[PDB]
Amino acid sequence: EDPPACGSIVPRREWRALASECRERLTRPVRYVVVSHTAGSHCDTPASCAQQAQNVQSYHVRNLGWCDVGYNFLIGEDGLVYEGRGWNIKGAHAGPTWNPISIGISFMGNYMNRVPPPRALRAAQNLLACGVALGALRSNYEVKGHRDVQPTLSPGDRLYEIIQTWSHYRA
Amino acid sequence: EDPPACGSIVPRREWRALASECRERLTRPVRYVVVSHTAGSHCDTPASCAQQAQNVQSYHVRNLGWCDVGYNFLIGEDGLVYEGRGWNIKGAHAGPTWNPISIGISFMGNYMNRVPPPRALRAAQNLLACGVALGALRSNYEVKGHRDVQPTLSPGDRLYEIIQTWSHYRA
Amino acid sequence: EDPPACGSIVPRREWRALASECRERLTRPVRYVVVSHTAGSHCDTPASCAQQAQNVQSYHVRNLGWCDVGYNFLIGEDGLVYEGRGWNIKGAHAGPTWNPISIGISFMGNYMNRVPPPRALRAAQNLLACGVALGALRSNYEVKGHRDVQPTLSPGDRLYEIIQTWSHYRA
Amino acid sequence: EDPPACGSIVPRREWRALASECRERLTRPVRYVVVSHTAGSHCDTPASCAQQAQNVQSYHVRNLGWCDVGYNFLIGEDGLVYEGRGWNIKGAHAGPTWNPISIGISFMGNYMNRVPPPRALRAAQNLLACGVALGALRSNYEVKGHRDVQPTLSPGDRLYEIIQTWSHYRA
Ligand SMILES: CCCCCC[C@@H](O)[C@H](CCCCCC)C(=O)O
Numbered sequence: 001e002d003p004p005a006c007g008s009i010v011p012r013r014e015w016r017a018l019a020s021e022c023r024e025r026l027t028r029p030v031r032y033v034v035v036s037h038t039a040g041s042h043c044d045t046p047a048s049c050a051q052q053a054q055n056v057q058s059y060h061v062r063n064l065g066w067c068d069v070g071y072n073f074l075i076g077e078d079g080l081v082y083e084g085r086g087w088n089i090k091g092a093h094a095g096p097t098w099n100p101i102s103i104g105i106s107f108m109g110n111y112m113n114r115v116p117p118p119r120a121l122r123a124a125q126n127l128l129a130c131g132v133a134l135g136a137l138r139s140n141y142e143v144k145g146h147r148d149v150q151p152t153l154s155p156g157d158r159l160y161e162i163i164q165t166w167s168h169y170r171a
Numbered sequence: 172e173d174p175p176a177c178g179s180i181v182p183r184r185e186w187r188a189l190a191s192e193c194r195e196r197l198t199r200p201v202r203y204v205v206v207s208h209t210a211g212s213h214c215d216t217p218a219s220c221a222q223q224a225q226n227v228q229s230y231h232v233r234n235l236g237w238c239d240v241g242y243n244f245l246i247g248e249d250g251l252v253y254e255g256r257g258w259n260i261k262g263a264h265a266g267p268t269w270n271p272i273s274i275g276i277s278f279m280g281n282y283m284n285r286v287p288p289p290r291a292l293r294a295a296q297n298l299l300a301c302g303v304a305l306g307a308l309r310s311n312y313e314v315k316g317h318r319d320v321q322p323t324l325s326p327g328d329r330l331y332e333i334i335q336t337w338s339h340y341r342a
Numbered sequence: 343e344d345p346p347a348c349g350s351i352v353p354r355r356e357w358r359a360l361a362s363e364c365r366e367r368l369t370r371p372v373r374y375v376v377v378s379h380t381a382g383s384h385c386d387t388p389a390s391c392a393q394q395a396q397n398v399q400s401y402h403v404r405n406l407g408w409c410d411v412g413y414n415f416l417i418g419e420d421g422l423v424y425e426g427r428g429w430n431i432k433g434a435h436a437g438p439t440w441n442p443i444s445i446g447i448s449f450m451g452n453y454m455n456r457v458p459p460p461r462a463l464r465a466a467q468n469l470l471a472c473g474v475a476l477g478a479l480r481s482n483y484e485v486k487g488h489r490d491v492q493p494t495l496s497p498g499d500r501l502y503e504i505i506q507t508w509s510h511y512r513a
Numbered sequence: 514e515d516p517p518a519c520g521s522i523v524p525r526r527e528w529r530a531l532a533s534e535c536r537e538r539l540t541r542p543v544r545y546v547v548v549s550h551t552a553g554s555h556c557d558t559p560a561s562c563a564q565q566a567q568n569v570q571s572y573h574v575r576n577l578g579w580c581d582v583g584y585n586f587l588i589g590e591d592g593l594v595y596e597g598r599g600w601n602i603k604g605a606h607a608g609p610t611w612n613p614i615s616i617g618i619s620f621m622g623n624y625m626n627r628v629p630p631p632r633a634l635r636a637a638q639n640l641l642a643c644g645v646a647l648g649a650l651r652s653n654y655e656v657k658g659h660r661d662v663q664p665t666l667s668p669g670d671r672l673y674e675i676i677q678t679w680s681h682y683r684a
Contacts, residue, residue, distance in 0.1 A: 001369035002338060002443070003300065008178070008250065008293045045216040046250055046290060079179065079217055080250055080290065119217060119251065122179040129175065135482070202534055202580065272534065311439060311578045338442060341537075381666050402664060412664060438609050493573060493583060494665065495552050 006130030007123070009073070009081045015050035017057055017083075022067035024090035024100075029138040032102040033128060034094045035163050036146035037155040042077050042109025044117075049076030052108050057084075066092055073105040073127060079119030081105075081127045087136035098149050103137065111156025121162065128168075142170040177301030180244070181253045186221040188228050188254075191239035195261040200309045203273035204299060205265045206334050207317035208326040213248055213280030215288070220247035223279050228255075237263050242277040244298060250290030252298045253279075258307035269320050274308065282327025292333065299339070313341045348472030351415070351423045357392040359399055359425075363409035366432040371480040374444035375470065376436045377505050378488040379497040384419050384451030386459075391418030394450050395426075408434060413448040415469060421461030423469050424450075429478040440491050445479065453498030463504065470510070484512040519643030522586070522594045528563040530596075531574055533581035537603040542651045545615035546641060547607040548676050549659035550668040555590050555622030557630075562589035565621050579605060586618040586640060592632035594618075594640045600649040611662050616650065624669025634675065641681070655683040 012020070038056055043049040053076070057069035070092035074082040084104075085091055093104035105124060107116050131137035145163055146154035148171055155163070163169055183191075209227055214220040224247070228240035235241075241263040245253040256262045264275030276295060278287045287295075302308035314337050317325035326334070334340055354362070380398055385391040395418070399411035412434040413426035426448070427433045435446030447466060449458045458466075473479035485508050488496035497505070505511055525533070551569055556562040566589075570582035584597040585604040597619075598604045606617030618637060620629050644650040658676050659667035668676065676682055 003296045004293045006178070006297065006300065008290065008297045010250075010290060014289060044218070047215070078249065079181075117217075118185065119179065119181060126177070126179045129177070133175070268536075309578060380664075406662065406664065491577065493551075493577070 006133050007081055007127040009083050009127070010046070010050070012083045015053045015082055017054065017069070018061055020068040020085065020089070022085060022089050026088050026090050026100070026103070028087055028136040030101065030103055030136065031138055031141060032098070033137065033141055033143045033168075034098060034102045034104045034146060034149060035124075035143060035155050035159070036071070036093055036104060036106045037111050037159060038074070038106050038108050039110050039154060040108065042114070044077040046076075046078050046080060049078045049080065049082065049108065052076065053082040056108070060092075070104070071106040072103045075105060075107050075116070075120050075124050075127070077109060077117055077120050079117065079123050081123045087131070087134060094146065095150050102144075103131065107155060107159060111159035112153060113158065114156070115158045115162065125166070141168060143168045144170060172306050173304070175304050177304050178297050179252065180298070181217075181221070181251050183254050186224045186253050188225065188240065189232060191256065191260075193238035193256055193260050196259055197261050197271070197274070199259070200306055200312075201272065201274050202309050202312055203269070204302075204308065204312055204314045204339075205269060205273045205275045205317055205320055206295075206314060206326050206330070207242070207264055207275060207277045208282045208330060209245070209277050209279045210281045210325065211279060213285075215248045217249050217251060220249040220251065220253070220279065223247070224253045227279070241275070243274045244276045246276060246278045246287070246291055246295045246298075248280060248288050248291050250288070250294055252294045258302060258305065265317065266321050273315075274302065278326060278330060282330035283324065284329065285327070286329045286333060296337070312339060314339045315341070348475045349423070349468050351425050351469070352388075352392065352395075353425050357395045357424055359396070359411070360403055362427065362431070364427055364431050367430050368432050368442065368445070370430065370478050371483075372429075372443065372445050372473075372478060373480045373483050374440065375473075375479065375483055375485045375510070376440055376444050376446050376488055376491060377485060377497050377501070378413070378435055378446060378448045378494075379453050379501055380416070380448050380450045381452050381496060381498070382450075386419045388420050388422065391420045391422060391424065391450060394418070395424040398448075398450070402434075412446065414445045415447045417447060417449045417458070417462050417466045417469075419451060419459050419462045421459070421465050423465050429473065429476070436488065437492050440486075444486075445473065449497065449501060453501035454495060455500065456498070457500045457504065467508075483510060485510040486512070515646070517643075517646050519639070519646050521639070522596050523559070523563065523566075525596050528566045528595050530566070530570060530582070533598065533602070535580035535598055535602045538601055539603050539613070539616070541601070541649050543614065543616050543649060544651045544654055545611065546650070546654055546656045546681070547611055547615045547617045547659060547662060548656060548668045548672075549584070549606060549617060549619040550624045550672060551587075551619055551621050552623050552667055552669070553621070557590040559591050559593060562591040562593060562595070562621065565589070566595040569621065573605075583617070584619045585616045588618060588620045588629070588633050588637050588640070590622060590630055590633050592630075592636050594636050600644065600647065607659060608663050611657075615657075616644065620668065620672060624672035625666060626669075626671065628671045628675060654681055656681045657683070
């Protein structure tokens with residue numbers, strides 16, 4: 001009811017999200033951040049990215065029968081962050097070992113032979129800083145790529161090589 | 172001064188801004204924020220908006236012969252903030268009494284019979300909070316419409332009505 | 343480990359409060375708390391403090407023509423808390439800038455050269471914990487002395503000296 | 514066009530006032546005058562009174578983040594009137610309902626127990642007569658004490674006693 005949130009996050013409802021049914025709660029301040037890719041289509045406008053966020057949530061809900069879109073946050077090439085399960089709900093993007101001790105953010109697209117535009121890298125880094133600000137992440141939070149906690153090509157070769165340059169990257 | 176380099180802002184070179192020739196400085200921290208519209212063409216995608224920002228800087232530099240685009244920041248319906256003279260440099264958006272003491276942000280479009288989309292208002296509000304965090308703005312800063320401090324329709328009847336409900340708005 | 347787990351508050355009706363005509367609401371969770379004193383006399387019994395809360399209300403309603411007593415809560419030296427406008431209604435105790443974003447608590451009396459008794463300070467700290475427990479105050483809310491946001495000697499030299507030692511005081 | 518020189522006022526320049534950042538104007542002729550005291554320590558010489566006017570401003574500007582000392586004028590025990598925000602700029606002394614429609618003058622000192630010397634009272638009345646002659650105040654202006662429009666001991670009991678007898682006062 002006062003000014004909106006840091007990181008300018010597109011709220012669940014704005015991208016016509018089916019309502020969440022998840023209950024497990026994340027014990028924030030959380031240690032880790034896991035960067036992955038959706039391996040779906042990429043989009044570069046808010047109209048094309050609201051549609052894509054909807055589509056990723058629907059594959060997770062209708063087909064895998066999950067309680068909500070598996071990722072805590074989604075990032076579109078349009079340069080905006082899309083609210084997934086948010087800062088407080090356990091995710092479903094990294095396995096039983098990690099989901100409980102991580103926030104999962106996922107870049108919408110396949111980044112094996114492509115890179116996300118700087119604005120998508122920007123929205124991401126800012127979403128992470130707006131994390132501690134709120135007090136959802138720990139000050140010295142570590143960033144792991146998907147393929148560092150699980151056997152998978154995610155987040156793609158090109159994007160995986162960028163996030164290693166990030167200051168908080170590890171292992 | 173302080174760590175939290177804040178929010179996402181599309182940089183000058185990305186929107187392909189002509190090099191600025193401005194040198195007068197504002198004194199940190201700034202008390203006032205004047206909100207305006209460009210009464211120009213609107214845009215809803217990262218690509219279309221960079222073009223628009225460029226057109227605005229162009230009309231300003233090339234035809235009005237100012238040192239740079241007149242606004243400190245522009246705001247696109249694409250939901251992204253565009254850098255202008257930035258936080259440190261005196262803009263040219265509100266006349267001689269106000270340009271020396273304010274930060275002028277301008278929504279790109281004609282908000283007479285249209286409100287800007289939610290994401291636009293969010294970036295706009297988000298940018299100000301970042302201003303505060305950086306120390307560019309006063310914690311108790313004040314938001315003013317363009318029409319409050321100059322004879323004009325700017326920033327549109329619709330968006331003027333909207334900014335009136337901002338907690339930092341003082342008439 | 344369940345619903346109403348906090349504090350003891352003398353309700354409006356129990357102190358004969360005149361009906362409230364205020365309706366504007368605070369946005370929970372509220373981040374700020376402003377500590378004042380009534381600067382008038384004190385009281386140290388259910389009936390005297392209940393009589394006084396009524397005066398302070400009379401002064402604000404009849405003499406000042408206000409919709410309800412200015413404070414969200416008043417603290418008696420009888421060690422009880424008097425429900426003022428409460429947790430959810432914007433008070434009038436700190437100006438147009440702080441009233442909308444804070445909870446105003448007034449200790450009944452004058453503490454320029456006098457401290458409130460141990461139990462009035464417990465009542466007030468206990469009220470705060472209760473505000474957090476309920477999600478009416480941010481877990482990391484801030485305490486401000488009235489003289490820190492308005493020109494006044496309120497809350498009196500001595501009480502002002504005490505609130506500054508508080509875990510939640512931010513100067 | 515009647516030309517008088519009612520202004521025996523110590524100019525901001527002369528009391529070493531920091532520069533005002535206030536820009537909101539009062540509409541003349543103003544109908545109300547609100548009398549407050551600074552509740553603070555006092556002065557009785559041009560030298561010490563200029564210094565006190567400095568601290569009173571320092572408090573409002575430095576400790577509180579205000580655009581200028583709060584009062585339109587201040588009254589010294591030395592018999593001189595100090596220029597505050599003046600006749601034309603809305604002061605910040607008596608709240609959002611009264612500030613836009615009143616001139617707030619404040620006696621430098623705490624008058625709960627002393628009365629200000631006759632020369633401070635004369636300075637105040639000649640100050641008001643002057644305003645009326647300039648066309649700044651309605652010939653029939655009403656004088657309110659601070660405690661009459663906001664909850665406060667200001668302007669002090671004894672000086673409150675005195676202003677209640679004034680010709681222009683009104684319940
Ligand atoms: C700024 C005033 C907003 C009012 C309180 C809303 C609050 O959620 C804020 C949201 C994001 C602000 C973070 C500063 C960059 C935060 O906790 O960080």
